[PDB]
RNA sequence: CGAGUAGGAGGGCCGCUGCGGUGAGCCUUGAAGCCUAGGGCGCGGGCCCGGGUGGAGCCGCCGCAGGUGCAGAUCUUGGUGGUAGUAGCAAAUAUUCAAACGAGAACUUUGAAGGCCGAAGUGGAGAAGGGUUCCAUGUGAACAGCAGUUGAACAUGGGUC
RNA sequence: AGACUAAUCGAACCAUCUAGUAGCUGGUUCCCUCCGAAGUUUCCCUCAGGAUAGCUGGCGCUCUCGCCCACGCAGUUUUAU
RNA sequence: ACCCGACCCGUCUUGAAACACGGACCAAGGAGUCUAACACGUGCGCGAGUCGGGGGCUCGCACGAAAGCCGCCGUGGCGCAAUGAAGGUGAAGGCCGGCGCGCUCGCCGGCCGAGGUGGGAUCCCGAGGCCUCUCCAGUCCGCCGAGGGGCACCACCGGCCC
RNA sequence: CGCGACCUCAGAUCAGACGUGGCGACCCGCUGAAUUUAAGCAUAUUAGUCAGCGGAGGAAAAGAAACUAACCAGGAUUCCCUCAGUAACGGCGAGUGAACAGGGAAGAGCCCAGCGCCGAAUCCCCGCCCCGCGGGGCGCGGGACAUGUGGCGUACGGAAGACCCGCUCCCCGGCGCCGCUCGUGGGGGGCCCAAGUCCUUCUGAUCGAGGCCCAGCCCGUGGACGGUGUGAGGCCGGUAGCGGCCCCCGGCGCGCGCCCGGGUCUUCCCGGAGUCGGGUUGCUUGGGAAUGCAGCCCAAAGCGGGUGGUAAACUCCAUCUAAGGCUAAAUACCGGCACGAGACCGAUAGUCAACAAGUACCGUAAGGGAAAGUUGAAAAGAACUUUGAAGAGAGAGUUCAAGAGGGCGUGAAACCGUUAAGAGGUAAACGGGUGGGGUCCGCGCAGUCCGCCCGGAGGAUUCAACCCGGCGGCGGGUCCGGCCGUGUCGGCGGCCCGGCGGAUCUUUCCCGCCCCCGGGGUCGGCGGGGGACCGUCCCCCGGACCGGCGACCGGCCGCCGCCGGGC
RNA sequence: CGACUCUUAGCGGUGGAUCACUCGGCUCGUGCGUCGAUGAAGAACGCAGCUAGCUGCGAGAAUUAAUGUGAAUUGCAGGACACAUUGAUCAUCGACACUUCGAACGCACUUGCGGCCCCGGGUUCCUCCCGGGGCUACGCCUGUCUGAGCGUCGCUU
């Protein structure tokens, strides 16, 4: 129950902040949970997502153990594109179907300097 | 327009009132402004009481209300001078000062001197440098509460008289009267002419 | 509305044209020019008596009647027939008013809530509120009122010392101080007898704070409990008593219908 | 015992919309609406039931609150008809034959004849105002009150020393 | 010529005051059950309107008849005058 | 299909099928509201009282712009008292005796203390008889002539204040 | 002639500063109508309002009495409740309409001229140095301001000066940090609980059901939103005097700048002018024999002046100190910068504007000012085959669906198209009455009753009684076995180891005081405590009723369900 | 017979009602409460790889530097794809710039016309030489400088 006096429990204000977010706020809404064996090593519940995370889809018409690689992350449509997720058009050309990463389990990450530094700050604060 | 039996109603609504109407929906908000204004005043000060200037004791000027008594505004300069303390000394003590107020009545005048003797007995002050002039020892942890409520002394405490019992005597139920109002009320209206009618009686000669 | 029900400016044509006498806006070219201006019955007209902010919203109620209502609504919450008639589940519950200890008001975690209400047999009422947290009917879903949820029990207490943190986000519960009572909480909607848990110092403050008929209420101003209309009110036990049914006429049970 | 305009009261498990209460109500296994030679109920306001459509929320009962119930106002705004394939496309003399491109020619282009404006011009150039209308190429759904293979249309690209 | 003054003239146009005023025209949205009239008096710058009575409705209240004579009342007769 | 009935609705109007007016046709929108004030009526709370309505106290807890409290916050409002232009004055009689010419006449002492008459729901006292031999006896139900203290209220008399 | 001084003056692209303009909701100063109402209309009312004009701020304005009062007297302003629809006004008509009290919010009070004292002890600028950074200031020399009078002490509450008495050492801003700050100082950034568990619907699932007597896991986190639909646990955030990171500001302490205050007595000092008032004339107000403002004229005084509400004298008294100045608060805000909430509106509603809205477009212009939200879960927005040149179609495909195909959700009614049925001379339509046909619907088509009881036929079960086993329950009197109920009372029990109150009392009881001749004195009066009294309600033995919704055993017949016996 | 007219009903079409949804309004309340001669509000034009409107910026023009965030922007191409090099994008905003008109400020407002001072070039000072930059409104405040007066005086030929 809301006990801040300075936060929105309005339907119209939250949808307005959703579809008119800035881009650096838009990174955190498209966050994806980690696999539960990998969360045991890191002590973090979910991660912001990027260009080269190997991904198990969980929900959709494309379900279960299809661990491919992602390629684009449209922030604009709140939609990622994975390698394996295909569907043909009419004119014989394949295209990629997008999945919102509330419906995505990250099994492999991309490891770099700033990805570690978040992960320390995430794991320490869960405490 | 008017009809079967009803009262003549003259409201003042010809003047276009809807432009000039103050609406009190800001009434809970100001009330929470003002507790949080007094409480912001509470934790600024220090040991000194909120509503801290002490008020005098004043009877209410009419024939209607002069049987009750009221915290006035400031102690008389001449009242406050009988207690012996200088003017701008006294406001730093925390006493209210009013130059406009006379003292016709020594029963009023001495009653406030008793009140100042009360307050200066009451006062626990703190110095800047403990040279010990008019200052306090380690005194009851700032005397058990920092702040008072609605004046330091409960200023109303309107004093009542008992005059509990007495035997009725001879010559009071024999002499007192309604008529000694009417004789005296008519005595007052005729003091001017009875002076003059006898004065021109002996001026005639 | 307040203004700008009609920002527009118009006068009426009148006679020599076949239209009507509503004001018509002045100009041309823009195809609202010529249309119907302000009034009720037009597009973009004002409404009929545009509602005013200085309506009489707030209602004042006598201070004895409010206290009469608290006195009545507490009295309904001591009968199991009335409180099941509101809709609560008391079928396996402990005897009515039910005083839990003053040890309750220092709970910290909320497993201690759930272990309490399952041991007091009040958990059946909460499990109804889980089944009743459906969505609103109407248009209120737009204006921030989206969840319909029926009430449960309420713990009436004094000396808040952690119970409001532990019982807080139980679904459908109202956690309520003794010396600040509401009629809007004790009898929601106007239908009396909400199932209520009293605490030891709660249920012992009520003797002090309202008083008997014999003593006063030693925590309020001048409020004795209000005197009664009937004293002994069993209608059947009065009417079968020896005093009445000696004194009566006779019964009369033949029908004697329309004789042809 | 029953009539009823103007009118006043009463009852409504009549309807609409919103709010606390309740229905361990209702539903992607199909809610609202809408339609219905389908089955009924009520004196009536109006409702319940089936079928068909659609695809995500809705209704009962007790209370509370209305900007709450249409045939009318030369009603406002929106929409469609009968009139109707009707009036009408009639100011200033006018077209014709052939040929080319083109799905497609009474009008576009060329060529010949027959013509009119007739130098106060239906000609040659400007001031005002119009502002890309000028030129070229390209298409033929609009628009040009018939048509168009044309244009002062649309589309692209040029030009005003 | 009372003409013309941006298709506006015996006082332009535009916006506000302004939702000006009107005893005067037009409209006034669901059913059922009960009761159901007036156009007359008097006065009013009253005569196309109101005021007042009359007429109408509603809400009550105070009582009586349920058992050789009741109480009360009347658009009626009778008997007197 | 047919027999019989059958003029087109609103409106003003002495009267409308009217040679009176508005109404081509459908959908949606659309017209006694709200604030103040007074009056009667009604429900509820209290009662010679009533009222927090303006303030303050609660911790600052989503719903809390709520609610709860004060009372040496009852100042005040309205009511308890009227009348007069105003100075102003401002609502108890009845019973048994006494004093003067006991008179067109006022005073002195006790004893209850809001008068009286006609009407007047209800209540009380009820003579009187009523129920299988008879006496002999108290409860008892119901009827009850007449009588009694009489509510609300109306009609009338007396009194009291200005 | 010539110079020098000062005053009136002008000149400058002089050195350096300043004003202009904007928004205008709230505030301030002037100006100012009319419709309306009076049933007409002039005064009145509308209203000192809309419009016009000027100024400013986060508030403004107002303000420390030329006041109210009329008695036990108050004591700056502003604001709220009351005074009050009241005194007053007014063709005394319609109407208009204060204030002092009283209770609240808030409370903060001061300076200058004059009077003289101090030798102009004061000030600005420049020059040169001082100082620490973020930038602005304190110590030295010259040039002005300035006697037509800067500064210090001074303000009507009195003040000053000289005695003498009493005691007295203060206050001030920077600076560097140790420390705290009422939800726990302000700002922004990044972060923190728990299922995708089995089975299953569906285009998709966030549904529907379930997880060991400990109720599957987290809850200080069940507010809300997103994600192929309805989510405490899938994601962001929500919860908390939760956690850390940066930036800023307000609460203790090394150096500057400054410092005689209090009482009594003696002496002298002590004030605002074409202003107050008076005349008149306009306007305004409730203000009336003139409330205030303003013009014109007349024009002041000192024991004076203004006021004290009916003009005018003769007074007595009350009360204030005008014609100089400043000052936070509570109060106001339909503009602006952020923000949460709504018994609101849901596209003909709501702002005119949910949209490329003050825009398209009209008027030369002042100005006027519209319409227009909706594909799907996702574009998977229909490749290819095939008539026509193409528009337009038939096949095909994608989709759960093209009965969603680019204003693409549902798609009503008017009106129109075709198919089916029925009818056709008194325009159509309608009410009553049956009829014919059609339509589905219901029955199962003459083949429809349901269950009860008994006397008959055929297989199986186990009673009832009647007792014993054992549970539970209802029903009664003694008050029985206790409590408690309800009351007349006794102890006055808690009285000071009691709760509440009491205009009951008590100088035989204190204290702060007043009195009578340093004290006692009871001669009276003021106030806080104390403790007898009541009047209710918190105790203890006893009786007086009652076992009444106040609950338990005892025992009683009679119900009762389970065991075991018995047709 | 058909044709036609009418009544229904199925199906198609016209039209956009109803219903549902809402990045929107109004209303209340809170905390702040700030504009411009250092050149405002407003107006004009300009600026994107493909760009007309809306928005955004101002010849540095769809913003640069820094701070924060740490990897995309997106209709299509292209590029640094790096990020123990200095880091893609957005957000914040404390550095730098801000063309033309506007109180608008050289004079006018016709892009017209000037006047000084300084540097670059070029007849190597100029003469109305071309480019580049500064200054040049009014009112007024104190200070300074120049000088007018038979204003009033002195000293004086
Ligand atoms: Mg909102
Ligand atoms: Mg009337
Ligand atoms: Mg008006
Ligand atoms: Mg307007
Ligand atoms: Mg509108
Ligand atoms: Mg609905
Ligand atoms: Mg009838
Ligand atoms: Mg319903
Ligand atoms: Mg319904
Ligand atoms: Mg509404
Ligand atoms: Mg309406
Ligand atoms: Mg009608
Ligand atoms: Mg019409
Ligand atoms: Mg037509
Ligand atoms: Mg023709
Ligand atoms: Mg013809
Ligand atoms: Mg050819
Ligand atoms: Mg061809
Ligand atoms: Mg010719
Ligand atoms: Mg020509
Ligand atoms: Mg051309
Ligand atoms: Mg071509
Ligand atoms: Mg054509
Ligand atoms: Mg073109
Ligand atoms: Mg003429
Ligand atoms: Mg003209
Ligand atoms: Mg005229
Ligand atoms: Mg009107
Ligand atoms: Mg208006
Ligand atoms: Mg009008
Ligand atoms: Mg009748
Ligand atoms: Mg008449
Ligand atoms: Mg008429
Ligand atoms: Mg009647
Ligand atoms: Mg008619
Ligand atoms: Mg006619
Ligand atoms: Mg007609
Ligand atoms: Mg017509
Ligand atoms: Mg409608
Ligand atoms: Mg009443
Ligand atoms: Mg009072
Ligand atoms: Mg009139
Ligand atoms: Mg006026
Ligand atoms: Mg104005
Ligand atoms: Mg200005
Ligand atoms: Mg400002
Ligand atoms: Mg202020
Ligand atoms: Mg001032
Ligand atoms: Mg009054
Ligand atoms: Mg007035
Ligand atoms: Mg959701
Ligand atoms: Mg959720
Ligand atoms: Mg989470
Ligand atoms: Mg006036
Ligand atoms: Mg004087
Ligand atoms: Mg004088
Ligand atoms: Mg006098
Ligand atoms: Mg003074
Ligand atoms: Mg002054
Ligand atoms: Mg719509
Ligand atoms: Mg509109
Ligand atoms: Mg979609
Ligand atoms: Mg083709
Ligand atoms: Mg479908
Ligand atoms: Mg659709
Ligand atoms: Mg659809
Ligand atoms: Mg959908
Ligand atoms: Mg046929
Ligand atoms: Mg259709
Ligand atoms: Mg549409
Ligand atoms: Mg940058
Ligand atoms: Mg230059």
For chain B, the DSSP string reads: ---SS------S-SS-GGGS---GGGHHHHHHHHHHHHHHHHTTS-SSPTT-SBP-EEE-SSSSSTTSEEE-S-EEHHHHHHTT--HHHHHHHTB-EETT-----HHHHHHHHHHHHHHHHH-----SS-S-SS---S-HHHHT-S--SSSSS-S--------------TTTTTT--SHHHHHHHHHHHTHHHHHHHHHHHHHH-
Q: Edge-to-edge, what's the strand order for the sheet holding A94-99?
A: A94-99, A79-88, A68-74, A54-57, A104-108
Q: Which two tokens stand for residue C204?
A: 């012992």
Nucleotides of H under 7 A from a protein CB: 20-24, 26-31, 68-75, 83-84, 87, 89-91
Q: Helix, strand, or coil here: A54?
A: strand
* Straight-line distance from the first to the last Cα atom of chain C, in angstroms, rounded to the nearest whole number: 72
Q: Give chains near C: 3+ CB pairs under 8 A.
A: A, B
Calculate how close chain C gets to A11, using CA atoms only, in Å.
6
Q: How far is the CA of C256 from the C1' of E62 (A)?
A: 36
Kindly identify which residue of chain B lies nearest to residue C3, measuring between CA atoms: B19
- Answer for B23: CB within 7 Å of strand H: yes
Closest residue on chain C to B21 (Cα): C54
A3 at the C interface (CB within 8 A)?
A: no
Angle formed by the axes of helices B179-189 and B191-204, nearest 10°: 50
Substitution target from A11, A13, A16 for chain C, most C beta carbons within 10 A: A11
Are A61 and A109 in contact, with CB atoms under 8 Å apart? no
Resolution (A): 3.9
| Contact of C10 with C37, CB cutoff 8 Å | yes
Token pair recorded at residue C158: 């004094």
Residue of C nearest to A13 (CA): C144
Q: How far apart are CA C103 and CA B121, in angstroms?
A: 47
Ion ligand 2 neighbours (CB, 5 A) are B 3
**Contact present, C152 and C128 (Cβ < 8 Å):** yes
Cα distance between residue C38 and residue C68, in whole Å? 51
- Pairwise CA distance, residues B168 & C186, whole Å: 61
Locate the chain A residue with the closest alpha carbon to C140.
Answer: A11
Secondary structure of residue A81 in the 3-state scheme: strand
Q: Is the CB of C47 under 7 A from strand H?
A: no
Calculate the CA dihedral of residues B127, B132, B138, B142 and round it to 10 degrees.
-30
Phi and psi angles of residue B203, each rounded to the nearest 5 degrees, phi first: -85, -20
> What six digits make up the tokens of C154?
């309420």
The beta strands (E) that lie in chain A are given as 31-33, 46-48, 54-57, 68-74, 79-88, 94-99, 104-108
Tokens 């003042």 — which residue?
A: B12
Rounded (to 5) percent helix, strand, coil in chain C? 30, 10, 65
CB neighbours of B169 closer than 8 A, spacing ≥ 6? Answer: none
CA pseudo-torsion sign A96, A97, A100, A104: negative
- Would you say A61 and A117 are in contact if contact means Cβ atoms under 8 Å apart? no
Biggest alpha carbon distance in chain B?
87
C66 touches strand G (CB under 7 A): no
Q: List the end-to-end C-alpha distance of chain A, in Å, as a whole number.
A: 24
Chain D positions within 7 A of any protein Cβ atom are 17-27, 57-59, 62-63, 67-68, 73-78
* Cα(C96)–Cα(C122) distance, integer angstroms: 12
What is the distance between the alpha carbons of residues A67 and B48, in angstroms, rounded to a whole number?
Answer: 73
Look at the block and give the residue holding tokens 């922030």. A75
Tell me if there are at least 3 CB pairs under 8 Å linking chains B and A.
no
Separation of alpha carbons B71 and B58, rounded Å? 6
A1 in contact with chain C, both atoms CB, cutoff 8 A: yes
Helix or strand or coil: residue A97? Answer: strand
Distance CA A23, CA A14 (A): 16
Cα separation, C98 vs C78, whole angstroms:
9
For helices C123-131 and C111-119, give the axis angle rounded to 10 degrees. Answer: 110
Nucleotide nearest to C185 (CA to C1'): F67
Task: Assess contact for C158 and C202: CB atoms under 8 A.
Answer: yes
- Cα C44 to chain center, whole Å? 39
Beta strand pairing call for B57-59 and A104-108: unpaired
SS3 A108: strand
Note whether A9 contacts C146, CB cutoff 8 Å: no
C-alpha distances (whole Å) from C223 to each of A57, A68, C66, C67 are 69, 77, 12, 9
Chains A–C, number of C-beta pairs less than 8 Å apart:
8
Contact C209, C217 (CB under 8 A): yes
Residues 6+ apart with CB under 8 A from B122: B152, B153
What's the token pair of residue A15?
Answer: 């949808």
Which chain C residues are Cβ-neighbours of B17 within 8 angstroms? none
The answer to whether B21 faces chain C, any CB pair under 8 Å, is yes
Nucleotides of E under 7 A from a protein CB: 14-16, 18-19, 50-53
Residue C112 to residues C119, C155, C163, C174, C176: CA-CA distances in angstroms?
A: 11, 14, 10, 17, 18
Say if the Cβ atoms of A10 and C142 lie within 8 Å: no
- Give the residue carrying structure tokens 């009542």: B160
Please state how this structure was obtained: cryo-EM
Protein CA at C213 to nucleotide C1' at G539, angstroms: 21
CA distance A54 to A61: 19
B110 and B104 in contact (C-beta within 8 Å)?
no
> Could you tell me where the DSSP H helices lie in chain C?
63-76, 80-86, 111-119, 123-131, 163-166, 183-186, 200-203, 206-210, 235-239, 242-247
Long-range contacts of B64-70 (CB under 8 A, 24+ apart): B68/B158, B69/B156, B69/B158, B69/B159, B70/B155, B70/B156
Query: Do C100 and C122 contact (CB within 8 A), yes or no?
Result: no
C-alpha distance from residue C15 to each of C10, C27, C41, C62 (Å): 16, 19, 20, 60
- Smallest CA-to-CA distance from B59 within B68, B51, B46 is with B68
Integer Cα distance of C23 and C211 in angstroms: 69
**What are the tokens at C26?**
């002045």
Beta partners for residue A87, in sequence order:
A95
């Amino acid at each position: 129950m809301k006990f801040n006096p300075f936060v929105t429990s309005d339907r119209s204000k939250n949808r307005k902040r959703h579809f008119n977010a800035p881009s650096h706020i838009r990174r955190k809404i498209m966050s994806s949970p980690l696999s539960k064996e990998l969360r045991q090593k890191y002590n973090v519940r979910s991660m912001p997502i990027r260009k080269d995370d190997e991904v198990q889809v969980v929900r959709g018409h494309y379900k279960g153990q299809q661990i491919g690689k992602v390629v684009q992350v449209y922030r604009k449509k709140y939609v990622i594109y994975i390698e394996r997720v295909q569907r043909e058009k009419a004119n014989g050309t394949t295209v990629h179907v997008g999945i919102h990463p509330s419906k995505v389990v990250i099994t492999r990450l991309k490891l770099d300097k700033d990805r570690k530094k978040i992960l320390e700050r995430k794991a320490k604060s869960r405490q | 327009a008017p009809s079967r039996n009803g009262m003549v109603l003259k409201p003042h609504f010809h003047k276009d009132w809807q432009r000039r109407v103050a609406t009190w929906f800001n009434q809970p908000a100001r009330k929470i402004r003002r507790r949080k204004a007094r409480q912001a005043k509470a934790r600024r000060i220090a040991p000194r009481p909120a509503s801290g200037p002490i008020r005098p004791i004043v009877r209410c000027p009419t024939v209607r209300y002069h049987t009750k008594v009221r915290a006035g505004r400031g102690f008389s300069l001449e009242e406050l001078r009988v207690a012996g303390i200088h003017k701008k000394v006294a406001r730093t003590i925390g006493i209210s000062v009013d130059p406009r107020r006379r003292n016709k009545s020594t029963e009023s005048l001495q009653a406030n001197v008793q009140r100042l003797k009360e307050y200066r007995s009451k006062l626990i002050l703190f110095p800047r440098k403990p040279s010990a002039p008019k200052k306090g020892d380690s005194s009851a942890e700032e005397l058990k509460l920092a702040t008072q409520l609605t004046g330091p002394v409960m200023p109303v405490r309107n004093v009542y008289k008992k005059e509990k019992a007495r035997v009725i005597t001879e010559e009071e139920k024999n002499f007192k009267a309604f008529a000694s109002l009417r004789m005296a009320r008519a005595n007052a209206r005729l003091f001017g002419i009875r002076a003059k009618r006898a004065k021109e009686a002996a001026e005639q000669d | 509305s307040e203004l700008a029900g009609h920002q527009t400016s118009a006068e009426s044509w009148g006679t020599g044209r076949a239209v009507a006498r509503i004001p018509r806006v002045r100009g041309g070219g823009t195809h609202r020019s010529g249309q119907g201006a302000f009034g009720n019955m037009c597009r973009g007209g004002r409404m009929f008596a545009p509602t005013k902010t200085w309506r009489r919203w707030h209602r004042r109620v006598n201070t004895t009647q409010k206290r009469y209502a608290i006195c009545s609504a507490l009295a309904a919450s001591a009968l199991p027939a009335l409180v099941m008639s509101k809709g609560h589940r008391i079928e396996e519950v402990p005897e009515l008013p039910l005083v839990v200890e003053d040890k309750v008001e220092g709970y910290k975690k909320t497993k201690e809530a759930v272990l309490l209400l399952k041991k007091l047999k009040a958990w059946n009422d909460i499990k109804k509120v889980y089944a009743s947290q459906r969505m609103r009917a109407g248009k209120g879903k737009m204006r921030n009122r989206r969840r319909i949820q029926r009430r449960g029990p309420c713990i009436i207490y004094n000396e808040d010392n952690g119970i409001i943190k532990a019982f807080r986000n139980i679904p459908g519960i109202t956690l309520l101080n003794v010396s600040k009572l509401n009629i809007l909480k004790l009898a929601p909607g106007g239908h009396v007898g909400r199932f209520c848990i009293w605490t030891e110092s709660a249920f012992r403050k009520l003797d002090e704070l309202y008083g008997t008929w014999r003593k006063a209420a030693s925590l309020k101003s001048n409020y004795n409990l209000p005197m009664h209309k009937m004293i002994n009110t069993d209608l059947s036990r009065i009417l079968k008593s020896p005093e009445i049914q000696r004194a009566l006429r006779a019964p009369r049970k033949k029908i004697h219908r329309r004789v042809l």
